[PDB]
Structure 1
Amino acid sequence: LKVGSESWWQSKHGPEWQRLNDEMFEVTFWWRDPQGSEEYSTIKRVWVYITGVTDHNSQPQSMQRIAGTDVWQWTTQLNANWRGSYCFIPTERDDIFSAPPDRLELREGWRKLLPQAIADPLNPQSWKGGLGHAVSALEMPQAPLQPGWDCPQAPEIPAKEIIWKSERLKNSRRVWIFTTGDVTAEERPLAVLLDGEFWAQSMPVWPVLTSLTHRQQLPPAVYVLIDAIDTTHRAHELPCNADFWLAVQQELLPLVKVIAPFSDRADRTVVAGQSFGGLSALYAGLHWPERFGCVLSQSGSYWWPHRQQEGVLLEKLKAGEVSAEGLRIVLEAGIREPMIMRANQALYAQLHPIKESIFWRQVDGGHDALCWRGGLMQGLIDLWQPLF
């Protein structure tokens, strides 16, 4: 009842929202200063950073402290269909975002601040982000269902983590092997997931796949999740790197097959990734359609390597150096990530001769795992649907 008191804080479990109109909701966020009120606290600003929203040309506004309390509060508006992740940035600095600002001023600003990002401690839905700070989930009421995520179930057989020591790549990484449905299942499709460490540890997919397979949305299957190791490895290995996929095919999969047998049918073999991983996943089906006949690409980085020039994959597809023949593809991108959107549309245009084998999807979200988690499940559902 009295704002900022223990009992008041008790009633707070993350942001609260209410409809403004048909299109928008108003949303309020609270952060509690561990250090107490103005007198006792060194905190000068708290920034709310919302993925795909905070980035998109006016001056950022801080949370404001309610005078005399440990409460910081900030209100904004969000689209009814929107879902995405956010973080708080409590900082002792007062120099960032003072000017009334250039697009590059903004980016620089957030670059300086993002190292101090934290998840909302009162939001139960928080995870270690992909960018070395924790984040929290926010979903507006009309955001679409994400298959399986609302009714996770304990895995029947927990995933096995092995170390894959690659002779070709001269490195070691974690691989997680997870099998679903009935043990005796024969000719189980294989799905390979890039950024495996994220989907194995940060936002574990196990209980969601379990849930969907139990209700026969997904066939019994073998999932192989590959650790990207770190940012540098990832940026070398994922974007169009033949040696990565030759190692995967010649060393990793034959190991996985003796531990967890799966089908050698390309037409049910899935390769799934996001950004560099989506690009990688397509690159794999274009060059080894005998092994990978199904591609799940979400927010694929089709601009690669050019951070106003076509990406190399698109160029090689234009030139007929590679064909998308013998492929089923889920191709997904968010509207709140405009440059990714454009690259994906350019690819889609190019894939015209193979247009009807493509599940083309747009989304009200950004470059954000909270959005991807749904499209990942739905994409696996679409690709495997002919097995039903």
Structure 2
Amino acid sequence: ALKVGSESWWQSKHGPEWQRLNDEMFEVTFWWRDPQGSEEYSTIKRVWVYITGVTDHHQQPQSMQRIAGTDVWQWTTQLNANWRGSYCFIPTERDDIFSAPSPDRLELREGWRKLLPQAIADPLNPQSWKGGLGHAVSALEMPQAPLQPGWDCPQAPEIPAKEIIWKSERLKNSRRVWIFTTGDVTERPLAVLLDGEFWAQSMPVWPVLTSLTHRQQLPPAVYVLIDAIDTTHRAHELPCNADFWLAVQQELLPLVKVIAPFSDRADRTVVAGQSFGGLSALYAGLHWPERFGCVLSQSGSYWWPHRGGQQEGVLLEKLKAGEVSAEGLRIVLEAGIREPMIMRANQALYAQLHPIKESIFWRQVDGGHDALCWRGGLMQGLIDLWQPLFH
């Protein structure tokens, strides 16, 4: 049947549905099933909907609304026909946490921060992962969302990626590393991606890279995906840790070379990363440009360590004091409008790289701070950095 709220009805639900309003706008509806039944048996009072690019800009958030006598929670909104991003739900028993119907942008960041720990991905949406803000999210793409190269038609890789556990002597820890290759022999470029777990497992990047290599938008290459181990490790290791890049160069890459040989030429060697991974990528090129020729930094966390509009980043001023220099790196530098604290931090950096201005691809995308946008960027950036190889 299709009795609202019946089991057969829930089975036909597979995430948010949407009906077009007009050329530019869509009405999007979201559902959540309460694993406790109707308002009588349940103990939840609010279900908040948090949408990555959007919800944190508004001004006063809406809860979902229960259909009386069912386990059904509903919520509706509008998005632009080309929007893509991620959302989550926050079912909660607490109801004070947006009690006062104003509020102010300080009472907000407060309240959301309080709540996001309890955030869940949409359990019916077939595509979910750990978000950029460290809370679980689901996918949402409007039908005119800009094409993202490769993602449109994955192709099964010929040789699957090999996971090894790299036991670093210097960093005194162990992590996974995936070594993935995209063609046989001939002098393939190396690309190292940070947050490998994510790109190996949450959004497995293999059939995408393959698709693009078949369509020769990317050269046969060797990809090294490096497990950030977890949040605290990531936050110590990724942003401007020298030991980190020492260990990879000294312990990791020599191994990789023996496993799947790759070119020695910094100019085709890539370091890719998002947020802290972007910041790390840049930092790596800066200090070891002989090993790392190309940088792909998406939404790089350049403020670091001063969160907000406080003080310029420790990398920005290590440059400002004309100290480390960006001599001879080609680099992709991207951030999204809808992200917008990070954006500021990024144009700050762009200026402070007045010298290299010429060999820097600089893009401002429709993205928030979000894996779902990043994935397209990631592909693109890789294409752009490897332009030179089709001379």
Q: Same fold (TM over 0.5)?
A: yes
Distance across 2 between alignment mates of 1:138 and 1:59: 22
Contact 2:337–2:364 at 8 Å: present in 1 too?
A: yes
Distance across 2 between alignment mates of 1:138 and 1:57: 19
Contact 1:181–1:214 at 8 Å: present in 2 too?
A: no
> How far did residue 182 of structure 1 move?
3.2
> How far did residue 22 of structure 1 move?
4.0
> How far did residue 333 of structure 1 move?
0.2
Q: Which moved more, 1:277-286 or 1:70-79?
A: 70-79
Q: Which moved more, 1:330-339 or 1:2-11?
A: 2-11
Q: Does the residue aligned with 2:55 lie in a helix, a strand or coil?
A: coil
Residue aligning to 1:48: 49
> How far did residue 6 of structure 1 move?
3.7
Contact 1:84–1:370 at 8 Å: present in 2 too?
A: yes
Q: Does the residue aligned with 1:271 lie in a helix, a strand or coil?
A: strand
Distance across 2 between alignment mates of 1:196 and 1:261: 20
> How far did residue 44 of structure 1 move?
1.6
Question: What TM-score results when the alignment is normalised by the length of structure 2?
Answer: 0.94
> How far did residue 57 of structure 1 move?
5.1
Contact 1:130–1:198 at 8 Å: present in 2 too?
A: no
CA, structure 1 residues 99+171, in 2 after alignment: closer, same or farther (shift >3 Å)?
same
1:343-365 Cα offsets, whole Å, 9 max, x none, are 11111122232222111111112
Residue aligning to 1:229: 229
Q: Does the residue aligned with 2:40 lie in a helix, a strand or coil?
A: helix
> How far did residue 253 of structure 1 move?
0.6
Contact 1:177–1:256 at 8 Å: present in 2 too?
A: yes
1:74-116 Cα offsets, whole Å, 9 max, x none, are 0112223321111111122222110122323222222232222
1:37-64 Cα offsets, whole Å, 9 max, x none, are 2222222211111112111153211000
Matches within 5 A, 1:294-309: 294-307=294-307, 308-309=310-311
Contact 2:289–2:329 at 8 Å: present in 1 too?
A: yes
Q: Does the residue aligned with 1:372 lie in a helix, a strand or coil?
A: helix
Distance across 2 between alignment mates of 1:161 and 1:377: 22
Residue aligning to 1:273: 273
Distance across 1 between alignment mates of 2:134 and 2:317: 33
Q: Which moved more, 1:34-43 or 1:378-387?
A: 34-43
Query: Sequence identity of aligned pairs in percent?
Result: 99
Matches within 5 A, 1:204-219: 204-219=204-219
Contact 1:268–1:293 at 8 Å: present in 2 too?
A: yes
> How far did residue 183 of structure 1 move?
5.0
> How far did residue 318 of structure 1 move?
2.4
Please, which of 169, 172, 185 is the counterpart of residue 170 of structure 1? 172
Contact 1:81–1:364 at 8 Å: present in 2 too?
A: no
Residue aligning to 2:23: 22
> How far did residue 131 of structure 1 move?
4.8
Contact 2:139–2:372 at 8 Å: present in 1 too?
A: yes
CA, structure 1 residues 44+149, in 2 after alignment: closer, same or farther (shift >3 Å)?
same
Q: Which moved more, 1:236-245 or 1:17-26?
A: 17-26
Contact 1:240–1:280 at 8 Å: present in 2 too?
A: yes
> How far did residue 250 of structure 1 move?
1.1
CA, structure 1 residues 230+6, in 2 after alignment: closer, same or farther (shift >3 Å)?
closer
Distance across 1 between alignment mates of 2:357 and 2:82: 28
Q: Does the residue aligned with 1:280 lie in a helix, a strand or coil?
A: helix
CA, structure 1 residues 129+338, in 2 after alignment: closer, same or farther (shift >3 Å)?
closer
Contact 2:194–2:272 at 8 Å: present in 1 too?
A: yes
Distance across 2 between alignment mates of 1:230 and 1:104: 29
Distance across 2 between alignment mates of 1:162 and 1:182: 20
Q: Which moved more, 1:138-147 or 1:11-20?
A: 11-20
Q: Does the residue aligned with 1:330 lie in a helix, a strand or coil?
A: strand
Contact 2:132–2:369 at 8 Å: present in 1 too?
A: no
- Please tell me the root mean square deviation across aligned C-alpha atoms, in Å: 1.7
Q: Does the residue aligned with 2:107 lie in a helix, a strand or coil?
A: helix
Distance across 1 between alignment mates of 2:376 and 2:89: 24
Q: Does the residue aligned with 1:38 lie in a helix, a strand or coil?
A: coil
Distance across 1 between alignment mates of 2:280 and 2:22: 41
CA, structure 1 residues 259+109, in 2 after alignment: closer, same or farther (shift >3 Å)?
same
Q: Which moved more, 1:56-65 or 1:4-13?
A: 4-13
Matches within 5 A, 1:231-380: 231-307=231-307, 308-380=310-382
> How far did residue 7 of structure 1 move?
4.2
1:178-207 Cα offsets, whole Å, 9 max, x none, are 1112355xx110001111111112111112
Structure 2 gap segments, 5+ residues each = none
Distance across 2 between alignment mates of 1:22 and 1:335: 22
> How far did residue 158 of structure 1 move?
1.3
Q: Does the residue aligned with 1:295 lie in a helix, a strand or coil?
A: strand
Q: Does the residue aligned with 1:352 lie in a helix, a strand or coil?
A: coil
1:237-264 Cα offsets, whole Å, 9 max, x none, are 1111111111111111101100010000
Contact 2:131–2:370 at 8 Å: present in 1 too?
A: no
Distance across 2 between alignment mates of 1:317 and 1:146: 33
Distance across 2 between alignment mates of 1:175 and 1:201: 12
Q: Does the residue aligned with 2:4 lie in a helix, a strand or coil?
A: coil
Residue aligning to 1:138: 140
Q: Does the residue aligned with 2:327 lie in a helix, a strand or coil?
A: coil
Contact 1:57–1:102 at 8 Å: present in 2 too?
A: no
Contact 1:300–1:344 at 8 Å: present in 2 too?
A: yes
Contact 1:4–1:70 at 8 Å: present in 2 too?
A: yes
Q: Which moved more, 1:6-15 or 1:42-51?
A: 6-15
Q: Which moved more, 1:199-208 or 1:13-22?
A: 13-22
1:360-382 Cα offsets, whole Å, 9 max, x none, are 11111211111111100110011
1:127-151 Cα offsets, whole Å, 9 max, x none, are 2335554311001222211111121
Distance across 1 between alignment mates of 2:250 and 2:121: 41
Structure 1 gap segments, 5+ residues each = none
Contact 2:18–2:28 at 8 Å: present in 1 too?
A: yes
Q: Does the residue aligned with 1:312 lie in a helix, a strand or coil?
A: coil
Distance across 2 between alignment mates of 1:118 and 1:183: 45
CA, structure 1 residues 215+57, in 2 after alignment: closer, same or farther (shift >3 Å)?
closer
Contact 1:81–1:142 at 8 Å: present in 2 too?
A: yes
> How far did residue 220 of structure 1 move?
0.7
Aligned residues: 386
Q: Does the residue aligned with 1:40 lie in a helix, a strand or coil?
A: coil
